[PDB]
Coordinates of C-alpha atoms in Angstrom, one line a residue:
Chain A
X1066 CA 9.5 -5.8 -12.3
X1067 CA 7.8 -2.6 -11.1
X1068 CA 8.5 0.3 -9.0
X1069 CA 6.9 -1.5 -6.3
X1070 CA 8.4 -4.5 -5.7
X1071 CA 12.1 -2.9 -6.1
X1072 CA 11.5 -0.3 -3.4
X1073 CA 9.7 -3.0 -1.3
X1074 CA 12.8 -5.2 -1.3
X1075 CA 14.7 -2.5 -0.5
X1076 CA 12.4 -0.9 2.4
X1077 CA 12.4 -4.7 3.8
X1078 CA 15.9 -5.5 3.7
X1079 CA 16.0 -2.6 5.6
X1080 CA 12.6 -3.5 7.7
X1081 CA 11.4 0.2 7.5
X1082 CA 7.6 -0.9 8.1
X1083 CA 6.6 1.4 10.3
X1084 CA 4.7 4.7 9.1
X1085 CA 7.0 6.4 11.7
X1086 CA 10.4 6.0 10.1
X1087 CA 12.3 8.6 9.3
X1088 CA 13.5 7.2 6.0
X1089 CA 9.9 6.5 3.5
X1090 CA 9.9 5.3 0.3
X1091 CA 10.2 8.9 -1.4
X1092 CA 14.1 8.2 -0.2
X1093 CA 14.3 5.0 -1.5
X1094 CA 12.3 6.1 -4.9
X1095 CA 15.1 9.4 -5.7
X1096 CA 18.5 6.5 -4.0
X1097 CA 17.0 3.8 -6.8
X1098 CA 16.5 6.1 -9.9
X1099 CA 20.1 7.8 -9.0
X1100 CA 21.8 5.0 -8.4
X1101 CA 20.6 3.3 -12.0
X1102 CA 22.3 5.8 -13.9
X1103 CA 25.5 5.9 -11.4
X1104 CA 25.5 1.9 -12.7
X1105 CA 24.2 2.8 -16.0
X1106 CA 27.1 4.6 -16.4
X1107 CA 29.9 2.2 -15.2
X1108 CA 28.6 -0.3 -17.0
X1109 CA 28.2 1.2 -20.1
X1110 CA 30.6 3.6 -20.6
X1111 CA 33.8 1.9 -20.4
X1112 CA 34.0 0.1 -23.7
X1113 CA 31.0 -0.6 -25.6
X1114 CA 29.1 -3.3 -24.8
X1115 CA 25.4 -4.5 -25.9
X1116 CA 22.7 -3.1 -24.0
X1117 CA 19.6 -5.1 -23.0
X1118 CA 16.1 -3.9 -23.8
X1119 CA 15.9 -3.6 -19.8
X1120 CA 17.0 -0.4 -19.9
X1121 CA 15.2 1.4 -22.3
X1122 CA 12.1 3.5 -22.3
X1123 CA 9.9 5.4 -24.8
X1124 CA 8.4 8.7 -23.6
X1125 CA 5.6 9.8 -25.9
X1126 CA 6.0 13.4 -27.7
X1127 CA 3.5 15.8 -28.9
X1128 CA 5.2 18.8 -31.8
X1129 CA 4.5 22.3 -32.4
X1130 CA 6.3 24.9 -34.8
X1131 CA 7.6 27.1 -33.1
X1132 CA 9.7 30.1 -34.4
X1133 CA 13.7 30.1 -34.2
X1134 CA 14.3 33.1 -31.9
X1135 CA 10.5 35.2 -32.4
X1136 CA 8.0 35.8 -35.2
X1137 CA 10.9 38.2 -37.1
X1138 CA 11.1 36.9 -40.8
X1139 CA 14.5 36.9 -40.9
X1140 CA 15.3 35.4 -38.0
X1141 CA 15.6 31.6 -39.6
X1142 CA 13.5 29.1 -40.3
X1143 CA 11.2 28.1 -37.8
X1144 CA 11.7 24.2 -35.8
X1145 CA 9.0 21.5 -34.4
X1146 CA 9.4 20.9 -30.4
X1147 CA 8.2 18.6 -28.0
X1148 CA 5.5 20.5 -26.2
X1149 CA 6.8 19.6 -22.9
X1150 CA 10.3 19.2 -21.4
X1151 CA 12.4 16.0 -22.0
X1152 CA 14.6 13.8 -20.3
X1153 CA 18.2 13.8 -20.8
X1154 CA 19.3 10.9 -22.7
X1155 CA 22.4 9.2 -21.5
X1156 CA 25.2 8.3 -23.6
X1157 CA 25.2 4.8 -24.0
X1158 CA 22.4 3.3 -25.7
X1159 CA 21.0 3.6 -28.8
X1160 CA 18.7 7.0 -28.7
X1161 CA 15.9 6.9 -31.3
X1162 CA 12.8 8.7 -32.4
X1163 CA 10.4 6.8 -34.4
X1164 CA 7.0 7.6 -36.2
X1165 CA 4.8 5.4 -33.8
X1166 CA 6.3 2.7 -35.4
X1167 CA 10.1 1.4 -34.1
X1168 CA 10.2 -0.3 -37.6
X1169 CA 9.5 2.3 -40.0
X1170 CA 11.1 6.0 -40.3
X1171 CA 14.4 7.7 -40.4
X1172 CA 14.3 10.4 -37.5
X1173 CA 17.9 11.3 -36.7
X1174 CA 19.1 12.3 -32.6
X1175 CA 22.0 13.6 -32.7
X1176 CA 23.8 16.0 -30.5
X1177 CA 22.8 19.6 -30.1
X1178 CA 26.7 20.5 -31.4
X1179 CA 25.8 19.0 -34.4
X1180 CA 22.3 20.3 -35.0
X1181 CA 24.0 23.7 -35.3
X1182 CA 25.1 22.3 -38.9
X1183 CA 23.5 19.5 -40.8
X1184 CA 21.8 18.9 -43.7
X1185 CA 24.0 20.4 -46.3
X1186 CA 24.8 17.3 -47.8
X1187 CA 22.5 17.6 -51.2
X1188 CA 21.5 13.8 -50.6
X1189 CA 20.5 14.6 -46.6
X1190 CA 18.0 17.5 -46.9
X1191 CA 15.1 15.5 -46.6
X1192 CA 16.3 13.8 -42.8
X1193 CA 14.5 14.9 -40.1
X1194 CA 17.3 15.9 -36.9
X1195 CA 16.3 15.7 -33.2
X1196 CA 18.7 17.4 -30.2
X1197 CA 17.8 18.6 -26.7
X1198 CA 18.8 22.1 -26.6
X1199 CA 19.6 23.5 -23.5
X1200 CA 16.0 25.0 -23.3
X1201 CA 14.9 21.3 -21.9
X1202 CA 12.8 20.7 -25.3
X1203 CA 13.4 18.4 -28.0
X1204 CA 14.0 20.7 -31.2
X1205 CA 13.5 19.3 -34.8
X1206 CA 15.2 20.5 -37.8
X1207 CA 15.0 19.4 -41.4
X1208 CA 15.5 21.6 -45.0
X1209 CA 12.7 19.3 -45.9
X1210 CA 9.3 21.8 -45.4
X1211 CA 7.2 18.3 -44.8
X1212 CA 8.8 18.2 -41.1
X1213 CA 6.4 20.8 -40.0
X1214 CA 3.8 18.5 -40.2
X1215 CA 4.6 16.1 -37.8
X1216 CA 2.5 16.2 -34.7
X1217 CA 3.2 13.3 -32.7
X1218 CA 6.8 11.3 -32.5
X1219 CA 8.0 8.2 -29.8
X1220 CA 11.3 9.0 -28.6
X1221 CA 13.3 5.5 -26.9
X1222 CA 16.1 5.9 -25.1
X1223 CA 18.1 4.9 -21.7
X1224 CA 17.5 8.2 -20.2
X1225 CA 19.1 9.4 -17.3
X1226 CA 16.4 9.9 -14.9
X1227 CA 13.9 6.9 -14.8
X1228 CA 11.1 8.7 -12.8
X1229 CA 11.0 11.6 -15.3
X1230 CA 10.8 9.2 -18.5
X1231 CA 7.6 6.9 -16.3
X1232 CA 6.0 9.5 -16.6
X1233 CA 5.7 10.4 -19.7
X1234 CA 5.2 6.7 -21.3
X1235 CA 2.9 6.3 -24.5
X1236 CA -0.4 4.8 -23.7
X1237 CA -0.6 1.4 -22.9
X1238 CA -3.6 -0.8 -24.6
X1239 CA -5.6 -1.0 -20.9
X1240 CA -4.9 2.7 -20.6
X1241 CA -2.5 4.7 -18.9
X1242 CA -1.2 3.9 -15.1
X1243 CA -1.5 6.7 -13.0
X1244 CA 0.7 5.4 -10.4
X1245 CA 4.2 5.3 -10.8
X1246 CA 4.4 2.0 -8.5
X1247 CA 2.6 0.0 -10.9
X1248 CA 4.7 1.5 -13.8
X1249 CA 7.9 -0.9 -14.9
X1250 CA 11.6 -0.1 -13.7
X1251 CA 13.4 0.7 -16.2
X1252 CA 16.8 -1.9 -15.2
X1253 CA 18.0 -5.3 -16.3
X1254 CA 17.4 -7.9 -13.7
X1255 CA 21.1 -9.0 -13.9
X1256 CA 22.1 -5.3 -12.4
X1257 CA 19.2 -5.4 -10.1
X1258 CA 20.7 -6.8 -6.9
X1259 CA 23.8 -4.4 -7.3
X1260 CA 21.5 -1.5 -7.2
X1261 CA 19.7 -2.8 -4.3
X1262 CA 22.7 -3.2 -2.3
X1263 CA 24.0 -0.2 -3.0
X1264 CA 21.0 1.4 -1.9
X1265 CA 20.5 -1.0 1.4
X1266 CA 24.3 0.5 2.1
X1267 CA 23.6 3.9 1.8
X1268 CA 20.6 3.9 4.3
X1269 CA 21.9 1.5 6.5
X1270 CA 24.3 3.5 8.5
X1271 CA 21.6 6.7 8.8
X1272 CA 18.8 4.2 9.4
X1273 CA 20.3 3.7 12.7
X1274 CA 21.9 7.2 13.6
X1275 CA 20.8 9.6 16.2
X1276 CA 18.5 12.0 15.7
X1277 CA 18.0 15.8 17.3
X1278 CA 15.1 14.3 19.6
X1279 CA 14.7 16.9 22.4
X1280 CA 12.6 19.9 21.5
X1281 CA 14.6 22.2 23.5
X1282 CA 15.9 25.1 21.6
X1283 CA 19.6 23.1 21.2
X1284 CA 21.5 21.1 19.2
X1285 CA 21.3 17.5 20.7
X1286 CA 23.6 15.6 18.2
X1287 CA 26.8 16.1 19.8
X1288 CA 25.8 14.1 22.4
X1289 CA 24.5 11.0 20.7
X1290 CA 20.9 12.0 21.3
Chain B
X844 CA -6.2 -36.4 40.4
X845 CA -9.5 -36.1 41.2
X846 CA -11.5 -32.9 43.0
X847 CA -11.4 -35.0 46.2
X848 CA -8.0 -36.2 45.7
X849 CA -6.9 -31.9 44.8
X850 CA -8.6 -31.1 48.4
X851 CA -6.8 -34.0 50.6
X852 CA -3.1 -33.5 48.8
X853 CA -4.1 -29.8 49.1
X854 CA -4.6 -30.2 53.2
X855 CA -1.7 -32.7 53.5
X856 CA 0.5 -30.3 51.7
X857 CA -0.1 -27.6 54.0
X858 CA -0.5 -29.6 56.8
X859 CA -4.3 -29.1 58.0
X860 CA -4.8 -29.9 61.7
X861 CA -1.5 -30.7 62.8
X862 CA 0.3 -30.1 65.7
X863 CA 2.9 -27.5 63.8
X864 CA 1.5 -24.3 63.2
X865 CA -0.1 -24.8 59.7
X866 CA -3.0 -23.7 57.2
X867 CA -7.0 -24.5 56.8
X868 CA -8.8 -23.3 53.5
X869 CA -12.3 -23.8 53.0
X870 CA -13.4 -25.7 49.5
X871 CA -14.3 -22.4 48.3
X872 CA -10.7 -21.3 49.1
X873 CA -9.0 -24.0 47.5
X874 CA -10.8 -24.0 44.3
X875 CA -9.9 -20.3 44.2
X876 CA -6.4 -21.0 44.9
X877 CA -6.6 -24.2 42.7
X878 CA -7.7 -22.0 39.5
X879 CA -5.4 -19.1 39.9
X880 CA -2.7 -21.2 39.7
X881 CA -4.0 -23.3 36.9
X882 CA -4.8 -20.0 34.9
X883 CA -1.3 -18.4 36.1
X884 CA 0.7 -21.3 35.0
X885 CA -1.1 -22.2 31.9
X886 CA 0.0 -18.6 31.0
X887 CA 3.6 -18.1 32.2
X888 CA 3.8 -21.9 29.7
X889 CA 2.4 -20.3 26.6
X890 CA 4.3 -17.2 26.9
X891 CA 7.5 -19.2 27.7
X892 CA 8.0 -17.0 31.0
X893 CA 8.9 -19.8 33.6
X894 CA 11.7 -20.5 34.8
X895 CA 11.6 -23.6 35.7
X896 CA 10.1 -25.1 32.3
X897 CA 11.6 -21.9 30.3
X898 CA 9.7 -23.1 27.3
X899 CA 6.8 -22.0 25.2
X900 CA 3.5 -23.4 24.1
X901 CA 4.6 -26.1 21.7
X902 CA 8.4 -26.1 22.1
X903 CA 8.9 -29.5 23.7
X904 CA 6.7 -32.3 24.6
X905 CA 6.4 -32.0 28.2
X906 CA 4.4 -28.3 26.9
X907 CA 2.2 -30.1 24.5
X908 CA 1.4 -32.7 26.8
X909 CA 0.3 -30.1 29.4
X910 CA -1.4 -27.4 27.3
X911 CA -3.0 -30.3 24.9
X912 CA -6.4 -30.1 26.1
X913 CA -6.9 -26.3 25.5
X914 CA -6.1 -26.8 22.0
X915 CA -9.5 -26.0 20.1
X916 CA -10.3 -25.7 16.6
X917 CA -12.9 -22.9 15.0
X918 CA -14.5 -22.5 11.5
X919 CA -16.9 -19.4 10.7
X920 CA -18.3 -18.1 7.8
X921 CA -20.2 -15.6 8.8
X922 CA -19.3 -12.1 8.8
X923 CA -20.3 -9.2 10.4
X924 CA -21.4 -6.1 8.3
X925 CA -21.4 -2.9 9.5
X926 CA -18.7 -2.0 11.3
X927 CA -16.0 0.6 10.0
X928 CA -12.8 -0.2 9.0
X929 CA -9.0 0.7 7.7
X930 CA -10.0 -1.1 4.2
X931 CA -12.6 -1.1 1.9
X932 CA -11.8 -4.8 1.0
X933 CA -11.8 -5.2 5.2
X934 CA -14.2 -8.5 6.5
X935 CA -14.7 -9.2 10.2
X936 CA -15.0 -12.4 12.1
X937 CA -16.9 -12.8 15.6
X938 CA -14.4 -14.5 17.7
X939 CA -15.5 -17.9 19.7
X940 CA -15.2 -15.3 22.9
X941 CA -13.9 -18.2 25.0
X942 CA -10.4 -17.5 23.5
X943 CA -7.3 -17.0 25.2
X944 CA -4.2 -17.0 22.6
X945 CA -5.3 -17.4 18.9
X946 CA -1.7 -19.8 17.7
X947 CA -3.1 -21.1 14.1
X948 CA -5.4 -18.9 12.0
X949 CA -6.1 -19.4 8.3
X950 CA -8.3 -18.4 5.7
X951 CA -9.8 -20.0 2.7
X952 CA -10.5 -17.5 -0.5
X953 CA -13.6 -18.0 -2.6
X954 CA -12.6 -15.5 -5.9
X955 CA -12.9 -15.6 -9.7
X956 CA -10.0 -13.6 -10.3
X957 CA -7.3 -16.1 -8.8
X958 CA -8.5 -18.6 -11.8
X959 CA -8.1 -22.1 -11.4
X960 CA -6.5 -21.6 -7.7
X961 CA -10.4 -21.1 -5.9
X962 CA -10.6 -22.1 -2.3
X963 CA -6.7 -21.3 -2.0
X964 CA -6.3 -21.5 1.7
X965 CA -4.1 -18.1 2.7
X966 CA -2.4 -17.9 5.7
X967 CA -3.7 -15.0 8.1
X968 CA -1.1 -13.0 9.3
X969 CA -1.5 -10.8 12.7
X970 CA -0.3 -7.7 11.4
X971 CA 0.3 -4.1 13.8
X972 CA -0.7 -1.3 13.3
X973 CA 2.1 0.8 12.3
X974 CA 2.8 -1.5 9.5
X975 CA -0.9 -1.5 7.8
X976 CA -0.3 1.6 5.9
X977 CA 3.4 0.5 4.3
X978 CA 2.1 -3.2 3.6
X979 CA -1.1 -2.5 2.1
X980 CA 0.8 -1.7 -1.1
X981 CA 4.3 -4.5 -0.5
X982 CA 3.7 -7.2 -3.0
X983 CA 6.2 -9.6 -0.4
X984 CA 4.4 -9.2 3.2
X985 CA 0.7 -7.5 2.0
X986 CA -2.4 -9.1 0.9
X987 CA -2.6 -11.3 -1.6
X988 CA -3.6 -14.7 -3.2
X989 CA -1.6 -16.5 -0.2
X990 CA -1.5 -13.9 2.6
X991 CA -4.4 -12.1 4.8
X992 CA -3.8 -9.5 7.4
X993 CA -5.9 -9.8 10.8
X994 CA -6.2 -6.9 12.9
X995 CA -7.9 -7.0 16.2
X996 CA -10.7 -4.6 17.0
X997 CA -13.5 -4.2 19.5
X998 CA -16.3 -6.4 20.4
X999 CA -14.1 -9.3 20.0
X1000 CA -13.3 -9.0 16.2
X1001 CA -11.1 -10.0 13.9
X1002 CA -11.2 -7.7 11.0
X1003 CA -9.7 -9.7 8.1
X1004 CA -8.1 -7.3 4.9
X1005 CA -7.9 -9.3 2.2
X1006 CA -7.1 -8.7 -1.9
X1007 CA -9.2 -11.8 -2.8
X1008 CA -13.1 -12.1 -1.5
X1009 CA -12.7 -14.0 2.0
X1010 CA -15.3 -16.9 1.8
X1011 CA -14.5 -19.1 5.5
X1012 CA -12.5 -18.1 8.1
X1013 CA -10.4 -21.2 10.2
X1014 CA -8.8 -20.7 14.1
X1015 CA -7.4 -22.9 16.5
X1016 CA -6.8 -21.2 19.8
X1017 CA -6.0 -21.5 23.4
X1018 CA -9.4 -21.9 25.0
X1019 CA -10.3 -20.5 28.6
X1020 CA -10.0 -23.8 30.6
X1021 CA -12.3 -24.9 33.0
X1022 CA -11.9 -23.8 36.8
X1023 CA -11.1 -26.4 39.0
X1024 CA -14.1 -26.6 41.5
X1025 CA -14.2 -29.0 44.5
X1026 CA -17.6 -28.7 45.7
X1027 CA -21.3 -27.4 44.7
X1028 CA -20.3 -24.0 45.8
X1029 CA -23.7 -22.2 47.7
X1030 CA -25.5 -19.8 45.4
X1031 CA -24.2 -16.4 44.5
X1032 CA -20.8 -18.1 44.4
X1033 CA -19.1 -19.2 41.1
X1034 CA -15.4 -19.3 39.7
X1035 CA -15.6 -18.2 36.3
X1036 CA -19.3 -18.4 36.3
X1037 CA -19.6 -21.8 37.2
X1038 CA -21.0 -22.8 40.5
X1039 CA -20.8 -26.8 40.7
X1040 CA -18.2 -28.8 39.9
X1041 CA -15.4 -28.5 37.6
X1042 CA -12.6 -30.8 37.2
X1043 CA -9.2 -29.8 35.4
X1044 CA -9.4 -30.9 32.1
X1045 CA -5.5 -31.2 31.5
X1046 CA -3.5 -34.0 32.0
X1047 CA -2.7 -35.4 35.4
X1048 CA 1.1 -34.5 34.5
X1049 CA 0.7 -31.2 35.9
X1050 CA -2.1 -31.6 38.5
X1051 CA 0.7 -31.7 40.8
X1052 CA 2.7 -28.4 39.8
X1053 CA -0.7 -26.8 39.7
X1054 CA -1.7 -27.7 43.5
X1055 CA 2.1 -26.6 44.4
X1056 CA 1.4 -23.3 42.8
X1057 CA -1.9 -23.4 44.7
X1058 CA -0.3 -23.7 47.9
X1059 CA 2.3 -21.3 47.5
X1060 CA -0.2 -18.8 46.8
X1061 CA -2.2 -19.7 50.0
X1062 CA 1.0 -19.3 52.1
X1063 CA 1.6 -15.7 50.2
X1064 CA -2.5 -14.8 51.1
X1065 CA -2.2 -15.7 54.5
X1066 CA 1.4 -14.3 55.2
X1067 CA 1.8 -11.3 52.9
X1068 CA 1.1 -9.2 55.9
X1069 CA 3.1 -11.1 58.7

């Protein structure tokens, strides 16, 4: 299923057809991502369970060295990072980075706690570490002076924001879909009519409350206007 | 009953030259009285707004029986080119322009993209304004393989938006029935353009309501002022 046909159920089992309602699909587009990860979450976090391909997304990377702190030369060695900004991954999956190939590589995510200190193990200095520092980039770190040549990475994951990981998907064969409608929602279909409930209840109630209608210089709510 | 047998229950329900204080319409009269009540009652049926039948066009077999002779069926193909509309996939339809209330409308898709469904008859569905722009893009209640939206537009048009190439267009409407006319009225003088005799196409069931209706609206023309 797409974006589409999840906020059209929604939007029609509330009937908001009309151009002129007060509630359009952006609402229904921010209620459906947010309430993914709010059952994402109590799904998945209690005990572990197995996690259907549903949920998962790759977002498609592009690396450059970059220094530690600044160009100082003792200021550490220098890191890969994703050109641009990443999601945050939620806890609950199995987070990987991969070569272009899901089948092939050994690209470590870990946290960024750990990052701080790895590789001292004689037999791990040639493992290549990933961790979103608080910057909002995906750093790389390896002892291993091969890393820096990396230039392009997939990174799969159930991250926590499913507008944010649509649109940065790899290349599809056809091409790239510019609208986010006609991308895929990133949700198994057994945990689709929980979401859409929860999202028909939370704009039932204001679909049909008053509204501040007069354009007189007053607040009109307090009497049911 | 016939256009002779309209005028004499007409006169002997208002009592025409008796002693009482009564009513005379000329033919002319009568046929106007005759067809305004046809054309009222016809309506108030369809849209269910009677009281005393309280029922709509098809919603019990006294209505069918009554309305079954206004029933006509319409197939186009033709389209009309330029005109401007909300769509760039958007085809219009000149309607028969004897329609009253279009109740069936269908249309029959001639496409190579839906493969091996070609000729998939699509039900047309009226569709208002404000909900063009949101169901343009729904994938449950916008254009598709088995769905066309009709909007109305000027000139009597229907301006058919479609996914799928629209190759014939099918209608069966309500048509604009003919007056009832008792006599070769003079010239110059017509009921819905027609000057010489028209008989009431519906059934005989509700000749009888209709020349009631007639002459209550006589009584109301000639004693509205009183």
């Amino acid at each position: 299923m797409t974006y589409n046909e999840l906020i059209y159920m929604v939007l029609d089992e509330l009937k908001l057809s009309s151009d002129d309602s007060y509630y359009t699909p952006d609402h229904v587009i921010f209620l459906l991502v947010k309430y993914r990860s709010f059952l994402l979450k109590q799904r998945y976090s209690d005990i572990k369970k197995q996690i259907p391909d549903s949920d998962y997304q790759s977002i498609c990377l592009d690396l450059i060295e970059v220094p530690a702190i600044s160009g100082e030369p003792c200021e550490g060695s220098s890191y890969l990072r994703s050109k641009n900004k990443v999601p945050t991954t939620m806890m609950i999956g199995n987070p990987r980075v991969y070569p272009m190939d899901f089948y092939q590589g050994e690209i470590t995510y870990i946290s960024r706690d750990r990052m701080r200190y790895v590789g001292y193990n004689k037999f791990l200095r040639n493992i290549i570490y990933c961790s979103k520092a608080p910057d909002g980039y995906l750093y790389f770190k390896s002892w291993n002076p091969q890393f820096l040549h990396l230039e392009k990475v997939s990174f799969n994951a159930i991250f926590e924001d499913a507008k944010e990981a649509s649109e940065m998907a790899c290349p599809e064969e056809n091409g790239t879909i510019c609208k986010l409608e006609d991308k895929e929602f990133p949700i198994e279909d057994a945990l689709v009519p929980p979401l859409i409930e929860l999202v028909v209840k939370e704009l039932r109630g204001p679909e049909y409350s008053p509204k501040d209608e007069d354009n007189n210089a007053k607040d009109d709510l307090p009497d049911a206007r | 009953m016939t256009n002779k047998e309209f005028s004499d229950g007409f006169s002997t329900l208002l009592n025409s030259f008796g002693i009482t204080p009564n009513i005379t319409l000329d033919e002319y009269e009568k046929s106007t009285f005759l067809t305004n009540a046809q054309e009222q009652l016809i309506i108030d049926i369809y849209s269910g707004r009677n009281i005393i039948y309280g029922k709509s066009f098809e919603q019990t077999e006294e209505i069918r029986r009554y309305l079954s002779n206004l029933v006509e069926t319409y197939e186009t193909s033709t389209k009309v080119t330029g005109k401007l509309g909300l769509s760039k996939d958007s085809v219009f339809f000149e309607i028969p322009q004897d329609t009253w209330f279009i109740t069936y409308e269908v249309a029959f898709l001639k496409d190579s993209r839906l493969g091996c469904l070609d000729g998939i008859e699509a039900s047309v569905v009226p569709l208002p304004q404000d909900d063009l722009y949101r169901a343009k893009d729904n994938p449950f209640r916008g254009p598709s393989k088995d769905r066309v939206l009709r909007l109305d537009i000027k000139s009597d048009l229907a301006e058919l938006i479609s996914k799928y190439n629209v190759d014939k267009y099918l209608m069966r409407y309500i048509s604009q029935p003919t007056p009832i006319i008792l006599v070769d009225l003079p010239d110059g003088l017509s009921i819905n353009g027609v000057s010489t005799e028209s008989e009431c196409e519906l059934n005989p069931v509700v000749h009888r309501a209709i020349l009631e209706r007639a002459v209550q609206l006589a009584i109301i023309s000639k004693t509205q002022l009183t």
